[PDB]
Design a protein around this ligand. Structure first.
Ligand code: HEM
Ligand code: HEM
Ligand code: HEM
Ligand code: HEM
Ligand SMILES: [Cl-]
Ligand SMILES: [Cl-]
Ligand SMILES: [Cl-]
Ligand SMILES: [Cl-]
Ligand SMILES: [Cl-]
Ligand SMILES: [Cl-]
Ligand SMILES: [Cl-]
Ligand SMILES: [Cl-]
Ligand SMILES: [Cl-]
Ligand SMILES: [Cl-]
Ligand SMILES: [Cl-]
Ligand SMILES: [Cl-]
Lengths: 309, 309, 308, 309, 308, 309
């Protein structure tokens, strides 16, 4: 699916740009924003076409509140600001964001150039609050050294987990995406043994194998993020997490980003993670990673997005 | 997608070959031609299979006059010869051709080999009247220095624009293609400032950004080739342009090739370019580009192509 | 179709791994195997996700005897063991196999790693009975020197040819696969002239162009493997052949692997090849190639495989 | 020349890491530094070997002052701190730096990982003052849109321009490198026409051709950076400049980095640029770019560097 | 050897461009040409730097007549115009050329762009007299179907073969290049059996293995092009052949281009090919290939080229 | 470098083939062998030329016994059969082989094709006694999961370590190579913690970092294979390890192959590994790895190889 915006289902890339913006209270501002994002197809092709492979993609996310400024008329069944969490040890803040631009490509320059043109076309009408330059780290690993994104759904499985279906027909082909910008305590994670780290995660480190059911801690990241309803049905998200970092500031990050046809799934995951399940039995990953952002966006289908204003 | 004839929707390639032939007068000649083109999947796979990536493709087009020689009592709704245009200084001639082979691949040798096997199969039953070896020029630029194919529709939109549908069910999935071989006057074009060149096209040169409405001349290539009907519905074509040339003869060219479900769109674009809108307000690209050919072909779907005879 | 088990329609790859296993008798053996093959997407993603390109695929086949051991309740219409053929000169043995893993990827390491993990997970519950490491040879050639896979159906035609549809709706999206490990007599092949070899195959050698009607012998590999029904409709199979071998043991091989929605098409190709058409008019390719194995498997869709 | 440190002559890469550090006044600090950099070969191979292509390289630079802390005994003929410049309009500061790590590879992750291991092995013994993540921007361009690095010397020509020869035999195979972290005024550069910009640079923008001798401004960047002595001999540097940037902070950068067997050449270039020649006739590039750092380092041959402490 | 003019020893490329030009009579023409070719590294870097890989190369040759126009003062030992050969069946014409640009790169666009810039810079001062766009054909084949360039010397042997050394120290690091544009009779070639073609060339076709001593005809292309001196030392040239052609004009070509430190080696290969060894025993390759051009050029080192 | 026999210094490859053969007793057999190996550049180019990149290489090695059959009155200074070792629990057997072909390429088919042409040329004059198809395993790891070839010397150091020099001028540019086919016990090795595995090797598993001296056991693979003489001069070998295996027979292997200008270094390494230092303090890798072969070969330079006969 080449150079079409709102392509939620794109495979992993070598490079990422994650841009979060807030819109000006102004009224021109509101409309300048709407021009840019309703015609996002323009800059996407403008940059993307310059690469033979056409690996460039761009998913636009709109915050719950800014959504009301440009379409009170109609509303996705499950749009809202990010539910903040305050558990026993660890907390997930709900930080601000009106616009999300999730940008992926085989090269940095392509990412940066798209971002540059999006930012420039918005001018004073919007301000960047968060900017992450994501990158592939070896054989699909996070900076914690684990293969990261393994159990993502694929193909038909993935469209079903991520894209709005018959259950909210006005926004079919849409999605809800939550981002969280995690920073890691490298020195603390390093005092653990590989085997302790594996227990924290749920999978072997080098080989990326899932631990047997009998050796699988009930507060391993994998168990906490497994969702099974009362009828026995699993519910999945699609995650496009990328590494990022700065050596001098000593930040080592996993940029979380998950898409689902219903954020309830992503939110239950986050609750099970921060509050724990049974309560207090939280996700040990949180001991070594602190979320610095937390934002929810609606991802309009291509039709819906081209309709704005 | 993979090694199948009449794949009209293929992404851009690094190499292409455009062959235009005229069929012999005889009944033998007509039968040989029908054999070769209805069996086109043979040569296609025979060559294409030798490349792991499977990049090779071949779209066969048939001219209006040859179509009536072979399928008298069934005819796509809009098949007619290319309609020539005569402006005051610039003209679009209508030049011979019964067959088009539009061949694309990631490598020259593949395009060439297929062309060779095709020409060999037709033997004396057809004559090449035009042959162009297309190449990608840097970051998808034409020889005028502009990124070229940017606003091509993609994915679903491409299918809607290019492929015959419910209007003409007997030929669903076919298309209509028009070629024109343009030669540029590089001297004249170089005497223009970059900014003037950008005004001719309708986009910035290096950065490939559309000029905003208020800097966008009414006779820009972009403006004149934007087609909106009374209902306010935009109509697009699919373009597979490639650069070509010969240093010794001083030929620096752009092979135009456009696909449309209805050639009325392509024709309207052409007459806006050549005759202006308002009248006299013609496309300044034509001050720098001269068409040496103009042929229209019907592109049958696979099923229809295989039935010929 | 990324990292999805039972992706029958994958394009050709640089590397592949063909694993044939016999399952143990015990009910525990039957259960371990079923647990492993039903969660096959686990290892497939555990290794496949590690490659940016996502080229890794894995198709699981199940033999007739073993299927009857896990789902006596419902059977695919055409599942039976491979049918031995015994012709005027050559024979196609029917050999054991309860499980097939047909693994493909852009790199050997990925194939090997998936195999390792699969075999480790099966433990004592199964035994590797045939193992062959296929590799692409120049411009899609086999070790006989011919471009090999040319006339595979593609896209819709491939799906129509290989995938089970309305004819057996309980097993929709599945397939039937037949494998045969062939070994060549290279010296005998080399005493033929190129033109002779071209007549055996049905296509020119370097340029991979089909011989025209009148230069085609009646017993050419191509002619014999052309299946046209009484209404004039051709019936195709999907072949993922790879080369293999061992220089020290002087083994130069072609691993035949053919998928079809109805294996009778594949079976008819085999009969016409081994017994000949008309009879005695057998495929001269068999004068240079000897199949060491012969096994038929049913390829369950994801849904059916997942619920085994 | 694979995975050897102090490989000054490596071809351009897709990715860069530029790290500048200051050493602690301490004495352990001094020796921890010396372990790390004298055995730089260790981490270089440790990371580098993990990529089949072995594109990873790392040139270690030592500041004039820290050099005296670890080798008073012997000194390169031309080592000193960066000469700051204070011209009519524009100024080049001399900022601090003891250690330079110039890291190049085909991938980001390789760069980042090497940096991460270098930083971690230094611990409290050193502090990052400057960190630039350089990237290739299209067809070897800077963010000003010009092809950047064109006239670099190559092969034998490049070894002669950059590496210390018979003229200082104790440090044969060494080099002197100057870095400057330039930030651009995008909006101002954009108010220029392409043709004005070309006049500023010395070359055509899209085509990267050098302007004719008669149309070549005497204060074009090219003329100012051309060095010809009294006998008619040209003297060149080797430059490994990379783009870098941040969208939210609105910085758009060229990271300058030049190597020479004698910094006098680089320093004359900088003087001609900032002071102008004739004086006051300075480099118009400076109107659109401000140097935020300015540092000189000695680049020890592999032998000399392995000898430290 | 990155973006350096006169890189004679570059490995094979996917694309190349062969430009032959005749210079104008005027002293201004002579000067413009000299300015352009002497600053050739300008355009070479102007386009070549734009590709990360740096695959672009450009070798400049100068004909004998034109050299005498710019440096009557000093001459390379072996520079003369190409010597026409007129044999019992075939002939090698000697055709005009003052300048050769032998351009190679991984992409056509780079070759084309370098050519464009060069030709633009020469303006009215020169005229393109032959232009051919070479391209790699499958696994290093020519349009006759044979792997083509196999026995090129490499590394030191290549430098010893191609580069001028102690024998003529004034032009050290230079070379002598001969080009001939050959066109094939494809139909005639196709009436030969593969074995017949193999005997013409001297090597097996698909597998590119040299025929042994006793199966080698005396007039095989390989045999005739083997140059052994009286001390038993072989003498090699460096050939950067590429395929080219035009389907409409039915042109299927091999562009011959051969470098040697002493062109007499190349010349002796030509005589032995066209007149045969023993005489009349000519190279049967010439029964299927006709040279449309024939030009010799001296390839100055960078230093000498830079000072022209 | 390019398609030349005896290129000992080639960088790592994705595929390799190690063939070890025994020559026939006859004078015919000895002559055929001499023809094939002195003409090795034939097959090398015949296969290697078919790949644009020219990755294919072939290093021919000759055993001590066969050397005396063919070159009685000239002999490299240190050519002798492999010296077997017998430790208390682990042994290095000495196994037959007159010829080694060590073949590397970017693709299996190339290695295979060369092997095939070589075996075909020797016909009945030689028998294969060992054949191993090497493959790269992820990011240059062996089947034990460790990055493998890290501390291999590069560039000039590699030449100094691997290639015979002024010590033995008659054979300058030759080398001595030793092969051993090791099979691992994967069960035993898996029962170890990552940290224990790291202590066995001498480097961290995932990150491939050398353990600092104070955590580095005296019997680590790294420690035991570090060779420093009385003068304090380090002695290195060049290793071209590759993974190999068969799932069905449960073979998971490491093909050791080391090149040295003097096999005394390789032998000293081996006896430190197998017999310990101090005595009994053997390499724990051997608890998990068992050598099935052990053969030493002289690698003649090109000039010497071509002279055989
Ligand atoms: C010398 C011949 C031509 C040249 C150099 C040329 C060049 C370009 C360029 C540079 C663009 C902007 C990038 C892009 O979207 O492709 C463009 C757009 C376009 N051109 Fe052409 N073109 C040529 C002929 C034609 C012809 C003959 C037609 C129609 C019959 C045509 C139709 C279009 C259309 C439909 C677009 C997209 C306009 C939009 O919706 O933004 N072009 N062309
Ligand atoms: C030693 C084993 C075999 C070899 C070396 C071999 C070789 C070839 C070659 C060179 C072709 C032509 C290129 C192509 O279209 O793939 C071909 C075609 C084909 N082969 Fe095989 N083959 C073997 C076994 C088989 C077997 C066992 C079957 C059936 C069970 C089979 C069925 C087919 C079919 C259906 C085609 C396509 C023919 C057409 O419709 O044009 N092959 N084979
Ligand atoms: C139509 C023109 C030609 C064709 C199609 C052709 C084809 C071939 C082929 C297939 C080979 C064997 C593979 C190889 O080693 O490159 C070869 C070898 C060779 N050719 Fe040509 N060639 C042509 C013209 C020439 C000319 C004009 C010369 C001399 C001026 C020449 C000199 C050589 C040499 C020196 C070899 C290497 C022979 C050896 O030592 O094994 N070729 N050619
Ligand atoms: C089962 C067999 C072997 C395995 C799995 C193995 C594995 C390794 C590993 C993982 C390393 C660290 C990375 C590197 O620098 O390569 C290493 C280093 C090394 N190994 Fe081995 N090795 C094996 C056999 C041998 C043998 C038989 C020798 C010597 C005869 C040897 C000599 C060396 C040397 C010289 C180093 C570099 C040590 C240093 O200076 O840091 N290895 N090996
Ligand atoms: Cl970015
Ligand atoms: Cl995640
Ligand atoms: Cl072509
Ligand atoms: Cl267009
Ligand atoms: Cl495998
Ligand atoms: Cl087959
Ligand atoms: Cl970095
Ligand atoms: Cl610069
Ligand atoms: Cl060209
Ligand atoms: Cl040749
Ligand atoms: Cl192999
Ligand atoms: Cl080792």
């Amino acid at each position: 699916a080449r150079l079409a915006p709102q392509a939620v289902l794109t495979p992993p890339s070598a490079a990422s740009l994650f841009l979060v913006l807030v819109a000006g209270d102004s009224d021109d501002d509101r409309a300048t924003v709407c021009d840019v994002i309703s015609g996002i197809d323009g800059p996407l092709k403008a940059v993307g076409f310059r690469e033979l492979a056409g690996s460039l993609s761009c998913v636009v996310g709109v915050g719950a509140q800014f959504w009301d400024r440009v379409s009170a008329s109609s509303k996705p069944a499950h749009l809202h600001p990010f539910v903040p969490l305050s558990g026993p040890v660890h907390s997930a803040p709900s930080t601000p964001g009106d616009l999300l631009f999730h940008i992926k490509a085989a090269r940095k320059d392509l990412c940066f150039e798209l971002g540059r043109q999006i930012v420039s076309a918005l001018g004073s009408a919007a301000t960047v609050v968060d900017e992450v330059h994501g990158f592939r780290y070896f054989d699909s690993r996070d900076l914690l050294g684990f293969v990261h994104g393994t159990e993502n759904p694929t193909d038909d499985d993935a469209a079903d987990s991520a894209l709005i279906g018959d259950e909210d027909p006005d926004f079919r082909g849409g999605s809800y995406v939550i981002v969280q910008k995690y920073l890691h305590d490298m020195s603390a994670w390093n005092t653990l043994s590989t085997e302790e780290q594996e227990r924290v995660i749920g999978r072997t480190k080098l080989e990326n194998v899932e631990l047997d059911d009998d050796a699988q801690p009930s507060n391993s990241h994998v168990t906490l993020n497994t969702i099974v309803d009362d009828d026995g049905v699993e519910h999945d998200i699609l995650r496009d997490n990328m590494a990022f970092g700065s050596l001098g500031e000593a930040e080592y990050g996993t940029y979380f980003i998950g898409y689902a046809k219903d954020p309830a799934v992503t939110e239950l995951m986050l609750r099970r993670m921060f509050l724990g399940e049974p309560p207090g039995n939280y996700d040990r990953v949180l001991d070594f990673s602190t979320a610095a952002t937390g934002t929810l966006f609606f991802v309009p289908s291509r039709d819906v997005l081209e309709s704005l204003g």
